[PDB]
Amino acid sequence: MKITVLVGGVGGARFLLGVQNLLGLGSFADGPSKHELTAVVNIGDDAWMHGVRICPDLDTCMYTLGGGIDPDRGWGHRNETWNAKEELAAYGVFGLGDRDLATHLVRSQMLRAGYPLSQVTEALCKRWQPGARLLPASDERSETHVVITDPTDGERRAIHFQEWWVRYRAKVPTHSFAYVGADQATAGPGVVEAIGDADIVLLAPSNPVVSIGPILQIPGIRGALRSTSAPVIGYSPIIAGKPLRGMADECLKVIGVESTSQAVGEFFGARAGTGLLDGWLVHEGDHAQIEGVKVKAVPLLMTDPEATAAMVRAGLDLAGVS
Amino acid sequence: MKITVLVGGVGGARFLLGVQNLLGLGSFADGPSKHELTAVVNIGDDAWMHGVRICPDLDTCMYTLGGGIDPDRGWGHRNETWNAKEELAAYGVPDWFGLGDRDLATHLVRSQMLRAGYPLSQVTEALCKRWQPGARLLPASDERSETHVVITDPTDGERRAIHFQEWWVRYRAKVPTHSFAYVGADQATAGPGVVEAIGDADIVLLAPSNPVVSIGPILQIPGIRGALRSTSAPVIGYSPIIAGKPGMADECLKVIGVESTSQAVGEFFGARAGTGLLDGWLVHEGDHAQIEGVKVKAVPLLMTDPEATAAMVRAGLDLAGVS
Ligand SMILES: [Ca+2]
Ligand SMILES: [Ca+2]
Ligand SMILES: [Ca+2]
């Protein structure tokens, strides 16, 4: 009755909703359920900005599963304003909505008063009641950086992923990712235990480089994944069939990995080898073959919670879990 | 060509506007500037709230002289929204102190810089680059000097000390109140330029702000009181009592046992000829007070608009004998 999902990004939050919908958790409860859902949530995009701690992936899961996202926009609170962000531009310095800033103010007060991120998250979840346990991948700092060639002086510089995505991406040469603090971080409370005691571990179809990937840079987390009795089932984020055949993922390009279901599967690799996967789900019409890995094509579009519920169901089946 | 004003509250900001209109400064500039205006701004009400530093008297002066102040309330931005405050309520966390969305940006930038080591005086200059107040807004101190209120708390009848913000904003001066304490004043050094601005002034003015909790706490900083007593400039005070007609400076005066009269408040600051601070003391039309060592003159003293206040300023310059 225990599912653990590694998550990051808007896709991570939408996949958890499907897990909730299948198992009758959170907003989808009818009577108190028979299952508990645990998310190990990327902290790689976490940053101190304007004197307040911003945790995008934890916030996205918390608002989404708590019913706080705006249905039309698909991101951020309903009835959101950006008046503080406006004054900040006027003073000359994410989207940083007014309602969103309240979450940052409360989180910053708790962190500066000694509460670790794991407890700050539980405290915020009392209001949002996601119906899921949101464990930060680490209570230590582990911020995803992108090394560029800086055009002012031609020097290699490490830039926070958030700045790189909006300002430098596809505008200057980009060489590598760096996980600033990763080597000095430990797996956050409950995370190694959640991976060990699960009936099944799912890697959500988030960006493999900068949403799932940074979770794997926290010491201890990769070890738990490779040793757990739970089956590990990954979902491909590559959706073929788009107009003009879509685009390559830019973060995969930085590490020179092709934007195919085959390549991303090899990136996580086979647990029979030195990788992480027992199973690998790819979208209807797609194909992959990896020595040691169960590959199945099924629909993988998170159209709505009910489609995502079917995607979860396919993962349980491929694993052999009930 | 140098005037220095001690300020606190909405009235201090509105008095500064009158100085600016008289000398053609700030928004009132028409042609080259021949005068520089320095404000020494009360820091007694500053507080940390929600993990951000709130400096109300500085912000009031900055917003007012920069054209961003709220004419209806007099404190905070025009066209203010309170969505972040509402979300703070939804989380169930103080809740008697309004932090507007626009105003919160000021607090975020101030906080970020203070925590990075920038002294308050530098944060203020940095923020004034956007607002262009047309005046130098000097914090009375770069160190902490917060006014506290000793009350009897009604939930349990125990003596408690609360920040001035809580006594005024939450209880509205209705709880039994015993004393004020200027926690940190004796350990606070006079902020950069403050002593120099009092020393090099052609004239020093005390705005008609609250004498106990706006002007008074400036005077608790040891260096500042000394500069006033040794400066060559005349010091001209404006009485905040427009007696007979209505603000509860009345209630703070009551706490320290001072009568709510023009005579009493003038004696509170006292004569430089004695152990006091004033050379001159202006009171409203219809009032009478005179203090030995102090030239007292009744003049109109209502800050209805900048041009009336401009007259109030000139009346001080005249009484001092400066042109
Ligand atoms: Ca298509
Ligand atoms: Ca000190
Ligand atoms: Ca004293």
Numbering used by the authors:
A (entry chain A): 1 to 93, 98 to 326
B (entry chain B): 1 to 93, 95 to 247, 250 to 326
The authors write:
F420 is a low-potential redox cofactor used by diverse bacteria and archaea. In mycobacteria, this cofactor has multiple roles, including adaptation to redox stress, cell wall biosynthesis, and activation of the clinical antitubercular prodrugs pretomanid and delamanid. To determine the structural basis of dehydro-F420-0 production, we solved high-resolution crystal structures of the enzyme responsible (FbiA) in apo-, substrate-, and product-bound forms. The crystal structure of FbiA shows that this enzyme employs a flexible active site to capture Fo and EPPG, precisely positioning them for catalysis.
